[PDB]
């Protein structure tokens, strides 16, 4: 049995969040909660919301138990980029990509 | 008992019970052929000079086939020369029946 949550179109760059996601892959729900809580990265606010949402789904829709939950899989895919103009010297216009993430957390139960 | 036989410009060490692919022989599937013997070894040793007069190896042809395709490709740089050929070498499958020493 598995419970999942996907946060789509989060306005933060995939490479930045993955770094935070990698910190909790395989951890117990409790450990992951601590880690995010004292991870000094913006990404942590977002991963924490997907975790907690998956956890809720586990308990409320899928008949799993909070105390047995662990991050079975987590990954960050890239959404569509926001393209923005960054004006440079000499008439040049650069294009900044303000990138976008779809964050997935999947919880399982660590039985016995 | 083993024999060293010669078929298809090539030489093989055969023992009875052996299946062997050789160059294509002109003999119906199910036929039986006599291969020449160049050397017999095992219990007794007899040495052809080059073949041994009395001996022959008896083979039943199980069938004839085509080898898995080998692509033969040719390329020369800077000259737009390219060639691609598919090659399947024909062969015969033999079961080695007996060594008539």
């Amino acid at each position: 049995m598995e419970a999942k949550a996907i946060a789509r179109y989060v306005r933060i760059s995939p490479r930045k969040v993955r770094l935070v996601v990698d910190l909790i892959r395989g951890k117990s729900l409790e450990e992951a909660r601590n880690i995010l809580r004292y991870t000094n990265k913006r990404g942590a606010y977002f991963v924490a919301k997907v975790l907690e949402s998956a956890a809720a789904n586990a308990v409320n829709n899928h008949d799993m138990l909070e105390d047995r939950l662990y991050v079975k899989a987590a990954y960050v895919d890239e959404g569509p980029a926001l393209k923005r103009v960054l004006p440079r010297a000499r008439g040049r216009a650069d294009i900044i990509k303000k990138r976008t993430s779809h964050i997935t957390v999947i919880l399982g139960e660590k039985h016995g | 008992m083993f024999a060293i036989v010669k078929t298809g410009g090539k030489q093989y060490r055969v023992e009875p019970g052996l299946k062997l692919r050789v160059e294509k022989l002109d003999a119906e599937p199910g036929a039986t052929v006599e291969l020449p013997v160049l050397l017999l070894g095992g219990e007794k040793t007899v040495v052809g000079t080059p073949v041994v007069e009395g001996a022959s190896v008896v083979a039943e042809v199980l069938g004839h086939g085509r080898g898995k395709k080998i692509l033969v490709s040719k390329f020369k740089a800077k000259v737009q020369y390219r060639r691609k050929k598919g090659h399947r070498q024909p062969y015969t499958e033999l079961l080695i029946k007996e060594i008539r020493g």
């Binding site: 770094l19 990698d22 910190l23 601590n34 880690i35 809580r37 004292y38 991870t39 000094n40 990265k41 | -």
Partner: protein, 59 residues
């Protein structure tokens, strides 16, 4: 200067090998001896306001 510039595109292999040092180390945490909540060592506990066995702070 004369505007140096990459000579070849970096391979996926190379790029990712540069990143072999990029993994975050998780926050170091110890239990608060008063309320058992996990926290950074050497900090006043933000769950209960306790540090050095006493109440330091309203939380």
């Amino acid at each position: 200067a004369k505007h140096p510039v990459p000579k070849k595109k970096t391979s996926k292999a190379r790029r990712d090998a540069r990143r072999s040092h990029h993994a975050l180390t998780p926050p170091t945490l110890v239990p608060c001896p008063e309320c058992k909540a996990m926290k950074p060592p050497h900090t006043v506990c933000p769950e209960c306001g306790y540090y050095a066995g006493r109440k330091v702070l309203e939380v």
